[PDB]
A paper describes a structure:
We purified LMNG/CHS detergent-solubilized ternary complexes of human LGR4, RSPO2, and ZNRF3 (residues 56-267, ECD-TMD) from Expi293F cells cotransfected with LGR4, RSPO2, and ZNRF3. Cryo-EM analysis of this sample revealed two distinct LGR4–RSPO2–ZNRF3 complexes with stoichiometric ratios of 1:1:2 and 2:2:2, corresponding to a heterotetramer and a heterohexamer, respectively. We obtained cryo-EM maps of LGR4-RSPO2-ZNRF31:1:2 heterotetramer and LGR4-RSPO2-ZNRF32:2:2 heterohexamer to resolutions of 3.2 Å and 3.5 Å, respectively. In the LGR4-RSPO2-ZNRF31:1:2 complex, RSPO2 was bound to one protomer of the ZNRF3 dimer through which LGR4 was associated, forming a 1:1:1 complex on one side of the structure. No apparent interactions occurred between the ECDs of ZNRF3 and LGR4 in the 1:1:1 assembly. However, ZNRF3 made contact with LGR4*, thereby stabilizing the overall complex, particularly ZNRF3 dimerization. At the center of the interface, ZNRF3 Y77 and T78 formed hydrogen bonds with G435 and N437 of LGR4*, respectively. In addition, two pairs of electrostatically complementary residues (E67 of ZNRF3 and R392 of LGR4* and E62 of ZNRF3 and R460 of LGR4*) located at the peripheral regions of the interface might support this interaction. In the LGR4-RSPO2-ZNRF31:1:2 structure, the TM helix of only one protomer, ZNRF3*, was defined by the cryo-EM density, whereas that of the other protomer, ZNRF3, was not visible, indicating that the TM helices of ZNRF3 are flexible. The observed TM helix of ZNRF3* was aligned and in contact with TM1 and TM7 of LGR4 on the extracellular side of the membrane but made no contact on the intracellular side.
Numbering used by the authors:
A (entry chain D): 57 to 207
B (entry chain A): 29 to 476, 520 to 822
C (entry chain C): 40 to 143
D (entry chain B): 57 to 247
Write the structure that this text describes.
């Protein structure tokens, strides 16, 4: 059930061709989503960004792999939505895959892998440790990147 | 553009966050926009803005301002925007802002204002926007507001206003937007809104309104009206008579109980109508005139019938949600050409006619779960278009139509236990996700489509036993056990002599084992009959009485064998004591009665799952040992704990008798052969019972995971392995059987 | 982490001060929180007891909006009239070109 | 080597949510590309569009699933670039995958599947027959669609389970043989 996440970087050469650098990662397919292979453009989403019910502000194109870094639970005493609800909302907004950084919220794996009778059609992956910090650095340093979740 | 103030060529000066304690100096005399927000100016001295005659926009946000001199803003005759939010002002500076004859936008939010002087806002004849929210106001400043006839937008949210008096807004004819959310408003007088003929947006969310605000009838130009998160319970008839131009009404999160029948009639511009929890409503709302509805939602009510002309009136209806009601008969949905999503779950629909869903060319998602549907017309889905999601789960279905279903992506039928037939896989070309009451219906679709429940190893599709090696092993066990058990039974019970307890117990274990042999024979015969086509037979076998009979036979045989072994070992130990204790054992009748009691206990143990439902139907093998259930786990853990306690009891009894046994006493005594035979029997039985026990204990430990085929194979190969093994030891290792067979041969030859 | 109560390096601010606005800034592929005393252009402040949040001006043809459906000023070529942007002043109202809105 | 292709159609709701309709398809992974899984926006693409070496007119974003419809070789007596060259050029232009429609030219199947020592890092799929015409209809009828090529690893890995089954069968047979040898040894000793 392990997931291999590949991060790709572009540089549009003047002649027109593309050269790619790939960086490896490792996550785990959460039980909240199917264990399929997905791919798309990485778009970080704030944990509070999935709260809003007015999606007209952030109409994204279909097929964006969302990266959400969960924060420590005491900093959010009252949540608007559970992690499953946040993932389902992201899938509603056109995300082809959802990646959660659960380093600061070790219970997220618990409420994700928990027995749910309504699995999501798209994969849900969580990362932690060196992989999570590497992915977050890639997110907050490079201008654009594309993720390739494989099974 | 003197330092530290940033300055561009558009006469706009920015000095935010420079830590100034007073207004900056040395700036251009032609400055038009000055921004000194985020600074530390805690007081504005007199005539502090006498160097900017041409100022137009001024910002003082986040300055911790506390006192403004009355002459501080003197000479600002061209000021248009003045912001003073996020400060420490406690009273509105009426004296200071009196001279701003050209002000158009004033901000006073995020302050600690408690009282507005009666003479405030005098001279602000050009004011258009006023911010007053997030303050400590306790009442509407009627008189100060009366001096602003040109006001267009006013906000008073996040305050401590309790009620609105009559004619609180008699002036302010040009008002358009009024905000009052997150207040403590509980009472609105009848003529509180009189004079607001131009008002379009009224906000009253998060308040304490108990009754409906009848005063809104004096707002002919209302377009949006939100009072959600309130305490409104009853909406009377003709509540929105005075607002014919309504577009959206926010009324969710309310303790709604009853809604007037004619409350939402006319209202030709209303777009969405969502009412939940109106449990005292019995009739469908009278929506005549309302032709602009694009979404309807009436859940949690007692509505029983849908009017026929619903599709004729609401031409532009898009989504229709009518769950949690008492709807019995569905009308003709013909004419709802724009309908996309229909939700009707948790209702009392008992049938679907041919013409129910005729003309829904744009239908995409249809929900009918948790109803009483017992019959669906074969052509009921002939006229559907791009239908992607269908849900008929938890119903009384017996057969499912398939015509016109080629476009489906997701289909749900879980809970239709009466649905035994198999769905044809050729009518669901585009299906991707499926749910069925029984996993055996999923066999056809898989092309080895995420369908549930998964057809795991414990629920095979093609072959019941599986691998040819396992099939051969089970066949061999069956034949060996059957033949050897008949041989042993005939030999032991073919002599009309007094039967000692040892021989009687050996024969009793043999006849008990015969039933496990019969169970294995049933398994092999069922597998042979259903070779390759077990999917068809699986549902009939599991739900039928055959699985119950096989499971009862298996459980009864196992438990009777175990209890018989217990009683045999106890008898052996007692007789070993009696050998030098009395020299004669006289417990024949008592031991026979105890054996009968053990047999009856085995019968009751086998019959226990029969009263329960689903215990024997977990697997086609009909064994209680599950893949994980909540009741079956309890039954299996009870049974296996009893068996393990039995095993340790016999083990400790045997060790005790061995310790009390003298080494030289086994040289030539006849009972030595019998005690060695019993030792070997308990040896093999205890060894072969461990794997089943440990695999039944496996799901209780989450750290270890085993693929289903492993436990399936080991249970098929190990549960009846003692069955074939037990008589082999007696026939090939007990010298007494030689004399017994000779006596039987002599009897046969004599007869 | 300016004017912030709980800040992180990846998500920026997660909870602003009491009387401050929490605005989510979209910077290409990276999104993070921010606290401002007033919502930026194209957004309107919405006061609330648990947190104040910026929201996009949903009124079409608008630059700065007082509320969800009230525009203080539209872009060039459009006329202010009761918080609505009109390419031409309706009947009974004459355009004013100097400061760009409808007048009587 | 079977390839499963899903074609997704978007419908942006006014609220901001997305509604999807997926159409199934089946192709075959060619030996000229890896048997991975890919996904990206579908971009129709003329066979002669790769002939030009001026890429400035074809600056697409990275990660687009290319769809190429071949034609009869008669009308193209001199193909400037072979099919493998076209796949390589498309990949160089940032295509995450290439889906060929080889129904018109069946020789492209053996041209892609011929023994070559230069496989491409991105999958190359070929489709033919009714599947090809269906995919062509979707691509030239709908405006924008997203393809999801799934490798779909083959039938369940029953290797280790089969070894366990043979282990159990061998254990049973060895036990039977041991019992038989013990019994004949005891018979000889008693005799
Ligand atoms: C603002 O000015 C006051 C009054 O002089 C002073 O006590 C306070 O420290 C200042 N705050 C700053 C510089 O942040
Ligand atoms: C406000 O309305 C009242 C009642 O009609 C009127 O007497 C008063 O003059 C009005 N005030 C202004 C400033 O227009
Ligand atoms: C429904 O509304 C129409 C139009 O207002 C009215 O004529 C009719 O009497 C109403 N019907 C009921 C049953 O209230
Ligand atoms: C709605 O009110 C108008 C007058 O404003 C009237 O002509 C019309 O009949 C009414 N319609 C309904 C359905 O009540």
């Amino acid at each position: 059930e392990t997931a291999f996440v590949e991060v790709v970087l572009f540089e549009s050469s003047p002649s027109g061709d593309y050269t790619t650098y790939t960086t490896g990662l490792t996550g785990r397919f959460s039980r909240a989503g199917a264990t399929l292979s997905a791919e798309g453009e990485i778009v970080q989403m704030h944990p509070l960004g999935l709260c809003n019910n007015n999606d007209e502000e952030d109409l994204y194109e279909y097929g964006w792999v969302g990266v959400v870094k969960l924060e420590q639970p005491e900093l959010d005493p009252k949540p608007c939505l559970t992690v499953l609800g946040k993932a389902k909302r992201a899938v509603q907004r056109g995300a082809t895959a959802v990646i959660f950084d659960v380093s600061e919220n070790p219970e997220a794996i618990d409420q994700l892998n928990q027995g749910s009778e309504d699995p999501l059609k798209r994969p849900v992956v969580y990362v932690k440790g060196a992989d999570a910090i590497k992915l977050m650095n890639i997110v907050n340093k490079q201008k654009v990147a594309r993720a390739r979740i494989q099974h | 553009c003197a330092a530290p103030c940033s300055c561009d060529g558009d006469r706009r000066v920015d000095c935010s966050g420079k830590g100034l304690t007073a207004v900056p100096e040395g700036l251009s005399a032609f400055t038009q926009a000055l921004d000194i927000s985020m600074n530390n100016i805690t007081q504005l001295p007199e005539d502090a803005f006498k160097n900017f005659p041409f100022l137009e926009e001024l910002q003082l946000a986040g300055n911790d301002l506390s006192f403004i001199h009355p002459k501080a803003l003197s000479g600002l005759k061209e000021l248009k925007v003045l912001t003073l939010q996020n400060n420490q002002l406690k009273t509105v500076p009426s004296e200071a802002i009196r001279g701003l004859s050209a002000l158009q936008s004033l901000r006073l939010d995020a302050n600690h204002i408690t009282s507005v002087p009666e003479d405030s806002f005098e001279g602000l004849v050009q004011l258009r926007h006023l911010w007053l929210d997030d303050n400590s106001l306790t009442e509407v400043p009627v008189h100060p507001l009366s001096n602003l006839p040109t006001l267009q937008a006013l906000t008073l949210a996040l305050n401590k206003i309790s009620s609105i008096p009559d004619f609180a807004f008699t002036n302010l004819s040009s008002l358009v937007v009024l905000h009052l959310h997150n207040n403590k408003i509980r009472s609105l007088s009848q003529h509180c809104f009189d004079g607001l003929d131009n008002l379009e947006t009224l906000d009253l969310n998060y308040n304490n309104l108990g009754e409906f605000p009848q005063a809104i009838k004096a707002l002919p130009s209302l377009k949006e009206l939100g009072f959600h998160s309130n305490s409104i319970s009853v909406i009377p008839d003709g509540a929105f008579d005075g607002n014919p131009l309504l577009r959206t009404i926010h009324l969710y999160d309310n303790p709604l109980s009853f809604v007037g029948n004619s409350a939402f009639h006319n209202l030709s511009d209303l777009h969405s109508l969502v009412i939940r929890g109106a449990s005292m409503v019995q009739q469908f709302p009278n929506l005549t005139g309302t032709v602009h509805l694009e979404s309807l939602t009436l859940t949690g009510t007692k509505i029983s019938s849908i009017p026929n002309n619903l599709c004729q009136e609401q031409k532009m209806l898009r989504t229709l949600d009518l769950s949690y009601n008492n709807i019995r008969d569905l009308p003709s949905f013909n004419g709802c050409h724009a309908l996309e999503e229909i939700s009707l779950q948790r209702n009392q629909i008992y049938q679907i006619k041919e013409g129910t869903f005729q003309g829904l060319i744009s239908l995409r998602i249809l929900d009918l779960s948790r109803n009483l549907i017992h019959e669906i017309h074969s052509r009921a889905f002939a006229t559907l278009g791009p239908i992607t999601n269908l849900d008929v789960s938890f119903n009384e279905l017996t057969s499912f139509p398939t015509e016109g279903l080629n476009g489906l992506n997701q289909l749900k039928l879980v809970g239709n236990f009466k649905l035994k037939e198999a769905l044809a896989a050729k009518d669901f070309v585009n299906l991707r996700s499926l749910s069925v009451p029984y996993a055996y219906q999923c066999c056809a679709f898989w092309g080895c489509i995420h369908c549930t429940p998964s057809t795991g190893a414990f629920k095979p599709c093609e072959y019941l036993l599986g691998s040819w090696m396992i099939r051969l092993t089970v066949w061999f066990i069956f034949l060996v056990a059957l033949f050897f058990n008949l041989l042993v039974i005939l030999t032991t019970f073919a002599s009309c002599t007094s039967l000692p307890s040892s021989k009687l117990f050996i024969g009793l274990i043999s006849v008990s084992n015969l039933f496990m042999g019969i169970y294995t024979g049933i398994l092999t015969f069922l597998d042979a009959v259903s070779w390759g086509r077990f999917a068809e037979f699986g549902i009939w076998w599991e739900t039928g009485s055959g699985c119950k009979v096989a499971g009862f036979l298996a459980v009864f045989s196992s438990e009777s064998a175990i209890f018989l072994l217990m009683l045999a070992t106890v008898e052996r130990s007692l007789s070993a004591k009696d050998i030098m204790k009395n020299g004669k054992s006289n417990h024949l009748k008592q031991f026979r009665v105890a054996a009968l009691l053990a047999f009856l206990g085995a019968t009751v143990a086998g019959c226990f799952p029969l009263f329960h439902r689903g215990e024997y139907s977990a697997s086609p093998l009909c064994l209680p040992f599950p893949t994980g259930e909540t009741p079956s786990l309890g039954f299996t853990v009870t049974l296996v704990l009893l068996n393990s306690l039995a095993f340790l009891l016999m083990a400790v009894i045997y060790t005790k008798l061995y310790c009390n046994l003298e080494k030289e006493d086994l040289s030539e005594n006849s009972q030595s052969s019998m005690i060695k035979h019993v030792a070997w029997l308990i040896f093999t039985n205890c060894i072969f019972f461990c794997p089943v026990a440990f695999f039944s204990f496996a799901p209780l430990i989450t750290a270890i995971s085993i693929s289903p085929e492993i436990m399936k194979s080991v249970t098929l190969i190990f549960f009846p392995l003692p069955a074939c093994l037990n008589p082999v030891l007696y026939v090939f290792f007990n010298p007494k059987f030689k004399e017994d067979w000779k006596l039987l041969k002599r009897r046969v030859t004599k007869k | 982490c300016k004017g912030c109560l709980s800040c992180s390096k990846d998500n920026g601010c997660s909870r602003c001060q009491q009387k401050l606005f929490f605005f989510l800034r979209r910077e290409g592929m990276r999104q993070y929180g921010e606290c401002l005393h007033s919502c930026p252009s194209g957004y309107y402040g919405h006061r609330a007891p648990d947190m104040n949040r910026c929201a996009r001006c949903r009124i079409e043809n608008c630059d700065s909006c007082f509320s969800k459906d009230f525009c203080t000023k539209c872009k060039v070529g459009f006329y202010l009239h009761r918080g609505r942007c009109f390419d031409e002043c309706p009947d009974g109202f004459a355009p004013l070109e100097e400061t760009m809105e409808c007048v009587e």
